[PDB]
Design an enzyme around this catalytic site. Structure first.
Site, short mmCIF file in Angstrom:
data_model
loop_
_atom_site.label_atom_id
_atom_site.label_comp_id
_atom_site.label_asym_id
_atom_site.label_seq_id
_atom_site.Cartn_x
_atom_site.Cartn_y
_atom_site.Cartn_z
N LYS A 46 0.89 -1.17 0.00
CA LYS A 46 0.00 0.00 0.00
C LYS A 46 0.92 1.20 0.00
O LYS A 46 1.82 1.30 0.82
CB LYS A 46 -0.89 0.00 1.26
CG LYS A 46 -2.22 0.70 1.12
CD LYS A 46 -3.27 0.15 2.10
CE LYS A 46 -4.70 0.28 1.53
NZ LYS A 46 -5.61 -0.82 2.01
N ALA A 95 -3.87 -11.08 -1.39
CA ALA A 95 -5.08 -11.91 -1.46
C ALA A 95 -5.45 -12.23 -2.90
O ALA A 95 -6.08 -11.44 -3.56
CB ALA A 95 -6.24 -11.20 -0.76
N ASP A 111 -16.34 0.08 9.22
CA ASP A 111 -16.23 0.27 7.76
C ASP A 111 -16.22 -1.02 6.95
O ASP A 111 -15.46 -1.19 6.00
CB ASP A 111 -14.99 1.07 7.40
CG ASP A 111 -15.15 1.72 6.07
OD1 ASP A 111 -16.19 1.47 5.42
OD2 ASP A 111 -14.25 2.49 5.68
#
Ligand SMILES: c1ccc2[nH]c(-c3cc[nH]n3)nc2c1
EC number: 2.7.11.1
Length: 251
Positions: free
Chosen positions: A36, A87, A130
Site C-alpha cells: 500500500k 489476497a 467500515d
C-alpha cells in the site's frame, strides 16, 4: 526494519485517494505480498495521520485467517508504505459486479467467516465500522479476509442508525453484517439512495424491502440484524447459530 529497496514492485492492484496498492516481492525471501503506497503529503493534508497509525496498531497486533495480515510498515520522503498480506482472488466488491448477485450458500459462508472474524475482534474490544465489500478480500481458498482498519476503534450505506444520528455506539458491526448479507443476496445495499441526504432518512427510518426471490430464512436473519435498537440485535453466536446460516454455510 524494512526499506523500499527490499522489494520488487509489480502489477498494480488498487487505487484510492491516498495512493495505490501494488503486488510486490521481497528480494531475499522471494515472499509475495502487497504494498500500500500512501503519500505523507495527503495524509497530513487530509488530517488523517492519526487514523493511519491506528490502522497500523490494530491490524498488526491482530491475527486471524479472516483478517488481512499486516506484516509491518515503513516510510521515506514522499510517502509511507504498508506491507500487507496479498489476497489472490481480489475483493468481494469485484466478484459482486462480476456476478451481480450471490447464492445463499456463498452468502452464508461469507457471513460466517465474517461473523467469526468479528468475533475475534470484539473479543479484543476492537470494532471496524467500515465493513463494506470494497473492504473484503478473498484468499486462495476463496475465503474472506477483512481488510482495512482505518475507521477501527462518507458512504453512509454501511453505517447503523446510531452512528449516523451521531450517538452512543458499541453492535454496529452486526447492523453491517445485516447490510452486507442483504447486499450479497440482492446485489445492492438495502439502503441505497441517490443522495446522501435521502439515504440518511432511509437508514434512520430503517426503510428496506425484500425482492421476492429472497427466501424467508434470509429475511428473518436480516430483519433481526437491522433493528433500529442496538440492543435488540443478535449476538454473533446467534448469527452463527441461525438455521438459515447453518443450513447453508458450506464452511
Ligand atoms: C485484484 C486481484 C487480486 C488482488 N489482491 C489485492 C490485495 C490488496 C491487498 N492485498 N491483496 N487486491 C487485488 C485486486
Amino acid at each position: 526494519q524494512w526499506a523500499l529497496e527490499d522489494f520488487e514492485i509489480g502489477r498494480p492492484l488498487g487505487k484510492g485517494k491516498f495512493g495505490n496498492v501494488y503486488l510486490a516481492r521481497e528480494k531475499q525471501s522471494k515472499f509475495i505480498l502487497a504494498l500500500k503506497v500512501l503519500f505523507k503529503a495527503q495524509l497530513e493534508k487530509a488530517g488523517v495521520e492519526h487514523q493511519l497509525r491506528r490502522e497500523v496498531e490494530i491490524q498488526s497486533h491482530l491475527r486471524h485467517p479472516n483478517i488481512l495480515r499486516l506484516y509491518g510498515y515503513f516510510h521515506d520522503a514522499t510517502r509511507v508504505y504498508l506491507i500487507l498480506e496479498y489476497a489472490p482472488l481480489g475483493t468481494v466488491y469485484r466478484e459482486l459486479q462480476k456476478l451481480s448477485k450471490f447464492d445463499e450458500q456463498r452468502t452464508a459462508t461469507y457471513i460466517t467467516e465474517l461473523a467469526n472474524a468479528l468475533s475475534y475482534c470484539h473479543s479484543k474490544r476492537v470494532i471496524h465500522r467500515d465493513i463494506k465489500p470494497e473492504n473484503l478480500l478473498l484468499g486462495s481458498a476463496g475465503e474472506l479476509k477483512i481488510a482495512d482498519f482505518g475507521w477501527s476503534v462518507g458512504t453512509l450505506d454501511y453505517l447503523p442508525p446510531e452512528m449516523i444520528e451521531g450517538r452512543m455506539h458499541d453492535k454496529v458491526d452486526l447492523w453491517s453484517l445485516g447490510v452486507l448479507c442483504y447486499e450479497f443476496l440482492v446485489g445492492k445495499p438495502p439502503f441505497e439512495a441517490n443522495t446522501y441526504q435521502e439515504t440518511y432518512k432511509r437508514i434512520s427510518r430503517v426503510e428496506f424491502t425484500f425482492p421476492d426471490f429472497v427466501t424467508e430464512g434470509a429475511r428473518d436473519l436480516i430483519s433481526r440484524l437491522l433493528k433500529h435498537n442496538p440492543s435488540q440485535r443478535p449476538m454473533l453466536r446467534e448469527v452463527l447459530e441461525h438455521p438459515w446460516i447453518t443450513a447453508n454455510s458450506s464452511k
